[PDB]
Amino acid sequence: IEEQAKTFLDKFNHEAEDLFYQSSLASWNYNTNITEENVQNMNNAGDKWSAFLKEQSTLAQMYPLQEIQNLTVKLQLQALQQNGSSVLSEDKSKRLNTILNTMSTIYSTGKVCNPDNPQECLLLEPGLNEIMANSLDYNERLWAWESWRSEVGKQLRPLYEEYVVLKNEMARANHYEDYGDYWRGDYEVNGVDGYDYSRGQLIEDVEHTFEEIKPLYEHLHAYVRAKLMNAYPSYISPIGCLPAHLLGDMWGRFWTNLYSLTVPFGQKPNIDVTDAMVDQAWDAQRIFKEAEKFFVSVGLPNMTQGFWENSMLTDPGNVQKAVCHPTAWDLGKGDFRILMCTKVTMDDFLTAHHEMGHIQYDMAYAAQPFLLRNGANEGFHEAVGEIMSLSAATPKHLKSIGLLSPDFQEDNETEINFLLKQALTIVGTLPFTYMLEKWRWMVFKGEIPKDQWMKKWWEMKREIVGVVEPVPHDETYCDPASLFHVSNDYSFIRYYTRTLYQFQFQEALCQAAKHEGPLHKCDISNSTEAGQKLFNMLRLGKSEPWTLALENVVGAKNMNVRPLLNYFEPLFTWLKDQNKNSFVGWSTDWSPYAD
Amino acid sequence: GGNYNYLYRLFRKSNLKPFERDISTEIYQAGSTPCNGVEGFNCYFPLQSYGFQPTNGVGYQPYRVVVLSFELLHAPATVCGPKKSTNLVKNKCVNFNF
Numbered sequence A: 001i002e003e004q005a006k007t008f009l010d011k012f013n014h015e016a017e018d019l020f021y022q023s024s025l026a027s028w029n030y031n032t033n034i035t036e037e038n039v040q041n042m043n044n045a046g047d048k049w050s051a052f053l054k055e056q057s058t059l060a061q062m063y064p065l066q067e068i069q070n071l072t073v074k075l076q077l078q079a080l081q082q083n084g085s086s087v088l089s090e091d092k093s094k095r096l097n098t099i100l101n102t103m104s105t106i107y108s109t110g111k112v113c114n115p116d117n118p119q120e121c122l123l124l125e126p127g128l129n130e131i132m133a134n135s136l137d138y139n140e141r142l143w144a145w146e147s148w149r150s151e152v153g154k155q156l157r158p159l160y161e162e163y164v165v166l167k168n169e170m171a172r173a174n175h176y177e178d179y180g181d182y183w184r185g186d187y188e189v190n191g192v193d194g195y196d197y198s199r200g201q202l203i204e205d206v207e208h209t210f211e212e213i214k215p216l217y218e219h220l221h222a223y224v225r226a227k228l229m230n231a232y233p234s235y236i237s238p239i240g241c242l243p244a245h246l247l248g249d250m251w252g253r254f255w256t257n258l259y260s261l262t263v264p265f266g267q268k269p270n271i272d273v274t275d276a277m278v279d280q281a282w283d284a285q286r287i288f289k290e291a292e293k294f295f296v297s298v299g300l301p302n303m304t305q306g307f308w309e310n311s312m313l314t315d316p317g318n319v320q321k322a323v324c325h326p327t328a329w330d331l332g333k334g335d336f337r338i339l340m341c342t343k344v345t346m347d348d349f350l351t352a353h354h355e356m357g358h359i360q361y362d363m364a365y366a367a368q369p370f371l372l373r374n375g376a377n378e379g380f381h382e383a384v385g386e387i388m389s390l391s392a393a394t395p396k397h398l399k400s401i402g403l404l405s406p407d408f409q410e411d412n413e414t415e416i417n418f419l420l421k422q423a424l425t426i427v428g429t430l431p432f433t434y435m436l437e438k439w440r441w442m443v444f445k446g447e448i449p450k451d452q453w454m455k456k457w458w459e460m461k462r463e464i465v466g467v468v469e470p471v472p473h474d475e476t477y478c479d480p481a482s483l484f485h486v487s488n489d490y491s492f493i494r495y496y497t498r499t500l501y502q503f504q505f506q507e508a509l510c511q512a513a514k515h516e517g518p519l520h521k522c523d524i525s526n527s528t529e530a531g532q533k534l535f536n537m538l539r540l541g542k543s544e545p546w547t548l549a550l551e552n553v554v555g556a557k558n559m560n561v562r563p564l565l566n567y568f569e570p571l572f573t574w575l576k577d578q579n580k581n582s583f584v585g586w587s588t589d590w591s592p593y594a595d
Numbered sequence B: 001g002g003n004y005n006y007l008y009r010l011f012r013k014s015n016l017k018p019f020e021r022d023i024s025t026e027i028y029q030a031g032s033t034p035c036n037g038v039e040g041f042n043c044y045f046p047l048q049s050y051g052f053q054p055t056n057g058v059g060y061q062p063y064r065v066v067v068l069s070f071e072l073l074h075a076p077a078t079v080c081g082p083k084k085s086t087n088l089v090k091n092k093c094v095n096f097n098f
């Protein structure tokens, strides 16, 4: 009966909040002060949380799921009843964890040695990522691109084939058709009177939104190709694809390292307020106190006053071994801490606004039950953090926060320099993200057999992304598995939808703050009505369907690409005038070796 | 490490009458199945403990409460405020209260 499930969850909601607390408090003491008497302090305290949750999970199947009427207590029950693994045979369950540990340690400890000196050998993160991000030598970028895929990616090919079979068995025992349908279960919504969403409906909404970005991406692809021919003459065709090893990093995920070759007006400095911070003696604490004044300006609460003692805003005065990585912690019981090692720079002035945005999202849904204290889907949590960073990087906000000469002149040449640096990171990553999840979805359902994995991968690079390989690759390579998110078992569609939600939030908040100009000049400071539009979504958590959360801000029930294109229309107008003598589009027949 | 000595009751058959008190420790029975004094599904111990810890956000830290309740049965009198006394003047027509 349904009233027994309510009494089940309230014993759960008070044993979990304490056991999650000290399992996360011990993870704080390891992260900010590393010993090994802290790693053993967090492994036993971490396993008491994991052993407790599988005990309550096997108690949750005593209650049926379709004999429930209240939507909230049904949502908590389905998130706890989830079997996930453990549906496999107990010798297949240990084979899967052996593969996931072997693929993870090949990626982090794989070395590449030089053919002129076999005694010098580079790892990926120090040394191989620096060549792909800084070099202008064609022959050295071609060496680092091919040798990472032929010496490390060939080890992951027999391991990734066994990984697909075991993950499809686990997904079909949980009544999905494949493992790709298991990943799309985040966006599913069942029976809330007009707000429903199918797991197959996500596939059409991604492909419908993508064919409206292809006019903008084609003009960006044509402008970068014309600028790369001056940097690498006799290597690039003026009507063809771009070679895969000249894109700024190892995989071509972000084009953000191509800015020094593709800058529109290099005689205008892109605005940088780092010298005005060290001329006014701003400490470590000023960067957060101006960040807290931004959020109280819009109508959001202060920091919790436990935030100022418990947090560790710099690396300590001790030479203290403590993972230095910006992050926002939500230990529980209303205890919010930020861990970062901040330097006096406009870079960490902006990520301070980003990391505080995770905190203000966390402080808002802290009145829901324990199992609904996440973002409404996997994409909302990063998207609310980045609309705080866009509004703080504007020169309108910088001159009113005291950091820009009240006699500063923004010219139309510097807005093109700023918008093109945004499009190399935002627009340049959208066909990479769409192509990769489309390839992984077709591998799991079996539309691509294993004798055509690397054949269909490079046909989709030339057609969707416009990127050609420099050396042909047969079915002994596995080039997707040489990325971190593929070999470490992570979903990748959250980076596509976060980019679309980010400009839907920003365009909906600037109509409430009564903006008049272009969308990229907007700032939501001093408003109250925009914050009330934002706070009505922030407090929902997972208690409502995410389509119901979007109408509280945007006014629509689906993700939309038209606010993303309105942000880049000053660039799209300027790009169509720079490509009057160029060719827009590419040919899938040209190759850098096929002459 | 958590002060686990401060408990509260989280299951009862029926809400309390005003100023009523209940220190029993019988195993609660949520479902219809009888419990027979042992724990299990739908048979819960009725007391939980605040695990208080010094690094808790406000609203999670312990507050001490005192409830004063003045009652007036039908006696002849009892405790009350304090009566202050001022100075006394002499040889002047005055308005006095002794």
Ligand SMILES: *[C@@H]1O[C@H](CO)[C@@H](O[C@@H]2O[C@H](CO)[C@@H](O)[C@H](O)[C@H]2NC(C)=O)[C@H](O)[C@H]1NC(C)=O
Binding pocket: A029, A033, A034, A035, A320
């Ligand atoms: C890292 O934290 C641990 C524990 O928080 C520190 O180790 C000991 O902590 C106790 C407190 O319970 C002290 O009485 C001991 O003196 C600490 N050990 C030592 C060797 O000092 C540890 O000190 C912290 N790390 C550093 C570098 O201070």
Ligand SMILES: *[C@@H]1O[C@H](CO)[C@@H](O[C@@H]2O[C@H](CO)[C@@H](O)[C@H](O)[C@H]2NC(C)=O)[C@H](O)[C@H]1NC(C)=O
Binding pocket: A006, A070, A072, A073
């Ligand atoms: C079941 O649904 C009802 C409404 O559909 C929820 O009722 C609300 O409960 C809160 C506190 O529990 C009250 O403050 C509200 O006034 C109630 N609303 C109404 C319309 O009466 C109820 O909370 C849900 N059950 C659970 C366990 O959350």
Ligand SMILES: *[C@@H]1O[C@H](CO)[C@@H](O[C@@H]2O[C@H](CO)[C@@H](O)[C@H](O)[C@H]2NC(C)=O)[C@H](O)[C@H]1NC(C)=O
Binding pocket: A061, A081, A082, A083, A086, A087, A174
């Ligand atoms: C979870 O996996 C189990 C198999 O281990 C599935 O079958 C359940 O088996 C248990 C006994 O171990 C029964 O109590 C359940 O009734 C069975 N399933 C149900 C509730 O029909 C079970 O179907 C899986 N649960 C999910 C999430 O589908």
Ligand SMILES: *[C@@H]1O[C@H](CO)[C@@H](O[C@@H]2O[C@H](CO)[C@@H](O)[C@H](O)[C@H]2NC(C)=O)[C@H](O)[C@H]1NC(C)=O
Binding pocket: A412, A413, A416, A574
């Ligand atoms: C920035 O604004 C100036 C001012 O309008 C633009 O200069 C004009 O450019 C057009 C097209 O080349 C000419 O027909 C006008 O005669 C120019 N104006 C003047 C006063 O000379 C300039 O092109 C703009 N730059 C960008 C990048 O948009």
Ligand SMILES: *[C@@H]1O[C@H](CO)[C@@H](O[C@@H]2O[C@H](CO)[C@@H](O)[C@H](O)[C@H]2NC(C)=O)[C@H](O)[C@H]1NC(C)=O
Binding pocket: A297, A400, A525, A526
């Ligand atoms: C936006 O908010 C800021 C912060 O309160 C306002 O800045 C104040 O501006 C006045 C006059 O411009 C100064 O006298 C104050 O010293 C400023 N306050 C601070 C804390 O620096 C700003 O005026 C607001 N914008 C509008 C349009 O009202």
Ligand SMILES: *[C@@H]1O[C@H](CO)[C@@H](O)[C@H](O)[C@H]1NC(C)=O
Binding pocket: A296, A301, A302
């Ligand atoms: C936030 O804190 C400041 C001082 O730190 C205070 O003046 C302000 O009133 C606080 N905000 C609210 C809503 O009380």
